[PDB]
Every structure is written in structure tokens, then in C-alpha cells.
Write a protein that binds this ligand. Structure first.
Ligand code: CA
Ligand code: ZN
Ligand code: ZN
Ligand code: ZN
Lengths: 193, 193, 193
């Protein structure tokens, strides 16, 4: 069971979201439809609230937390890369937070923006829409190209389809002990076509 | 069960500490009273010993490890931020290790010091007491203000109370499938008063 | 059970590898003999394939992932440090990827090379054999010394022995509630001799 209450406060999870059985949701976490929450994601709403809006994804070993009475918000189609940490911040619609990046309290990321991997967005920093920001600490570098925004959108659509594939077919299994010529492989994923 | 033995060596956990059921304690880990160990914290004492002293906290997806026959020590009121990695080091009393930072072997952090997020403290580095150090690799920047030390203390007191709240009331639950007007929320946490 | 299928694709795990019960293997992951997979390692082969070759190790809260139809490869004696993230890349034989580092898509790391902790290897970067590379973003700094390569080899041999120790003796246990003079400790690990 990935969900835990604290002080009687129970997570809310849309039946149309996928939460991997190894993630942890604590306290006042609200997950909307279409969301993918990956392995070892910790959505810990024991000091404040966390709200993950529709069609967003939270990837592996990501952490979402905040200070007392904070609200940590990931808006629609937010795309939180592996190992990123979101603390008391607002992630705008269709933002990409790069792998292993840290977004600190009261920061806000404007819509469609991309945060590079390994970045740190300082507390209270307001990053505008449609830009690339990177570094540790990060700063705004330039506007995104149209190609970059389409690439980002496609990547989030893959995670929207991933949530459905996982709700449809992910199950615990005993591993095989060797390969074989007849086993299903990554070539049998729909992405192969 | 978060505890695992190796070579017959069994973790020691104070009944007055909280270890989240999804953390992992392996081998010669000793946890003292008042400690909070969060989700997916890996306290892996399969090469050496780990000792976490009273009223300290280890946050989500943190890792504590060391080389063979090492001793990795977090002293009283040590505050290990989300995703930090402690390797074969000594964390002094009431230190704050910022989110996603790495502290390498034989490093020592003096009491009350704050390590910024996303930092790397090099092997064998000796950081004095009562300073701010940050960067990757990190260096000492300046002394802490009195206000900064009081802020840090308050944050660790929140985790001391968190361990008690979790021992008192954290339990596995089925999530709710939608919000409602009568559900308990983060506004019902004591921090609201 | 650490293994999950997706679209009917089942992980392959050598009976001579150790996968910690808290890791997660999804989809087309193939693990060869002698490998150690640590706590909260996420080997997520739901977009492409992951292949971990013999005597390699993947450490705590590491993530291995890739884009659709990618192949993410860790060659023999690859040594993936705590919290590192491997995305769609090729890790050469006997490479060390430092803690909390990110290796991006299509990058290749030549044999015996060492990537410093907290590094970022950019997409499509080709790092040669037998060097040290570090930084975020990283660059090649210098060749490794002979001493450095022997030190690295010894560290991977410790993980080769660790997999056997874990297959031999790691088990879930109730923790002890206090220390005692007769308990087994890290001094009873073979490394003590
Ligand atoms: Ca990290
Ligand atoms: Zn926090
Ligand atoms: Zn280690
Ligand atoms: Zn990925």
C-alpha cells in the first residue's frame, strides 16, 4: 500500500492515475487523473499539502515536500525528472524539471519552461514562462525553440500513455532466470511501431 | 520490515525513534531515541558501522554508507536533507546537510554548520563549527547569523515532533478516490495553530 | 517481489546476482551473474532495454532509464555509485560512476574511466578510456594513475563479495531495542581481517 495517513489525513488518488506500489504518499497529497507516480517517489504531505494536477508525472526517487502549512503544486502536464526534489514550490503547466534538480521553497516555474538536469532553483525565485534555465544555482539562459517545446510535449505524452500501460498491465512477477528466443522484449512495446 | 541483518549483524533501533516502513536499515546501524528516518532512506551498514544519535533526522531517499570498517556518525540533532548522501563522514551536533548534497569519506562537519543544497564536501575535508559552506566542491563561505541558527533549530524541532506524530498516528490506508468537504486536510495539522 | 512486468515483458535475473528486495526491476531488464543491485535502485525498462553485465553493481536509490526503444548498458564490473542516474547511455567495462552523477542519453564512458561525484555527462558525449572526468557539466581532466585504477578495482571486488554475502546471509529481522556487549557488530565482518 503506497498511501499512509498522518493525524487522520488521507491521500486522495484519482482512479485514473497510476501510483507505483513502491512509491509513498503521506498525508495531504492529492493526485488527479492521468498522473504517473514512479518507483520510490516520496510525496510527503506531513507538513503541508501537495497537489499533482492532471497528466503530470513524478519519476523515480523524486521527493516532494514542503515546510509547515506550505502548498506544493505541480500543474497539468508537469514533468518531474528522475531524482528531482520539489520543496514548497509551484511548477507551472507543462514544465519540465530536469533530473536530479532541486526547486526550493516559494520558487515558481512559468509554463512550458525547462529546468536543466542537476540544477538548483533558489528559494523565492520566479522563473518566467517558455525559457530554459540551468545551473546550480540556476539562472534563465534563453527562450525555448518551438522544436524544444514540441519535443518536451511528446515526452510528456509518452508518460501519459505509460500511466495507462501500467494501469493495464503492470504486475509483480517472478523474474526469468535466463533469456530465451521466445521471450517478449522491449521490441514488443508499442513504441517499436 | 525495514531491518535486515548481514553476517548475523542486526540493526539496533530505539523504541522512541520512528523508522518509516519503507526505509532500509542493513547490518550495524544504531538508531537512538527521537530520530526520524524517512521514506526510502537507506542506512546501509554492510561495510562499516552507522550511528545516528538522538533527535537527528534522515530524510527521503537519503543514503548513509561507508567503506570497509568505517564509522559513519550523525550526532545529536543532525538534520540530513532530502536525497543527501553521507559516506564515511562525521556530521557534528545540530548540523544541517542541505538537500541532494554529498559528504565524502573522512570529512567532518563542525557543530551547528549548514551545508547548502546540491553541495559536495570533498574527502577528508574538515569544516569548522557555526559556518555556512556551499558549492560543488564546497568551501566555507561565512559564519552563520544568530537568526540562521535559530531558524535551523526550529526546523529540527519540527522533525522531533514529526517522529512523535508518526509513532502516534502514521498508518497504511486506502486512499480516498476524490476530495470531499469533510475530509481532514493539512489545515488539521497542529502546525496550523 | 522486486520484479514487475509491463506489456508482458518480464525481467531476467541470474540466480547468481543479488537484487535487494526493495529494488524495483520493470520490464526488459537483464541482470547477469555476480551483480549487486542495492536498496531502492530503480531499473526501469518500460521504454527500452537495460542490460547489466556480470560483476557490476548498482547502488542505493540509483535510477537506470531511457527513452523509447533505447538500450542502456552497464558493462562488466561497472560500478554505479549511490544515487547516480543512468539515462540511455553506455557504461564501459570497469567504469566508476561517482555518487549522485547523471549520465545522459547516448553518452558513452570508455573502459576503466572514473566520473567524479555530482557530475553531469551531457547527451551524446563520448568520454575516452582510462581518464578522470568531473564537473557539471563534466569534462575530461586527466588520465588515471595506476594506483587509482587498482583502488577502483579493489572497490568493485568488495561489491562482488558483497553480492555473495547478501545471497548467503541477508535476511529480514526485527531490530534489537538496545546495544549489548555480546551482539555481533561491524567488527565481525570479514573486512575486519
Ligand atoms: Ca540525487
Ligand atoms: Zn522538506
Ligand atoms: Zn558506498
Ligand atoms: Zn527517463
Amino acid at each position: 500500500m503506497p498511501c499512509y495517513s498522518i493525524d487522520g489525513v488521507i491521500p486522495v488518488v484519482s482512479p485514473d492515475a497510476f501510483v507505483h506500489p513502491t512509491a509513498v504518499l503521506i498525508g495531504d497529497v492529492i493526485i488527479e487523473a492521468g498522473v504517473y507516480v514512479g518507483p520510490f517517489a516520496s510525496l510527503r504531505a506531513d507538513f503541508g499539502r501537495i497537489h499533482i494536477n492532471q497528466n503530470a508525472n513524478i519519476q523515480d526517487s523524486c521527493t516532494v515536500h514542503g515546510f509547515p502549512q506550505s502548498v506544493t503544486l505541480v500543474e497539468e502536464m508537469g514533468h518531474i525528472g528522475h531524482g528531482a526534489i520539489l520543496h514548497g514550490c509551484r511548477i507551472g503547466k507543462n514544465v519540465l524539471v530536469g533530473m536530479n534538480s532541486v526547486i526550493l521553497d516559494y520558487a515558481e516555474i512559468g509554463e512550458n519552461t525547462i529546468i536543466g538536469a542537476n540544477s538548483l532553483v533558489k528559494t523565492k525565485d520566479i522563473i518566467p514562462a517558455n525559457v530554459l534555465a540551468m545551473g546550480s544555482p540556476a539562472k534563465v539562459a534563453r527562450d525555448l525553440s518551438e522544436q524544444e517545446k514540441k519535443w518536451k510535449t511528446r515526452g510528456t505524452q509518452e508518460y501519459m500513455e505509460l500511466a495507462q500501460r501500467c494501469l493495464n498491465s503492470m504486475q509483480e512477477v517472478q523474474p526469468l532466470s535466463s533469456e530465451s528466443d521466445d521471450r517478449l522484449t522491449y521490441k514488443d512495446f508499442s513504441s517499436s511501431n
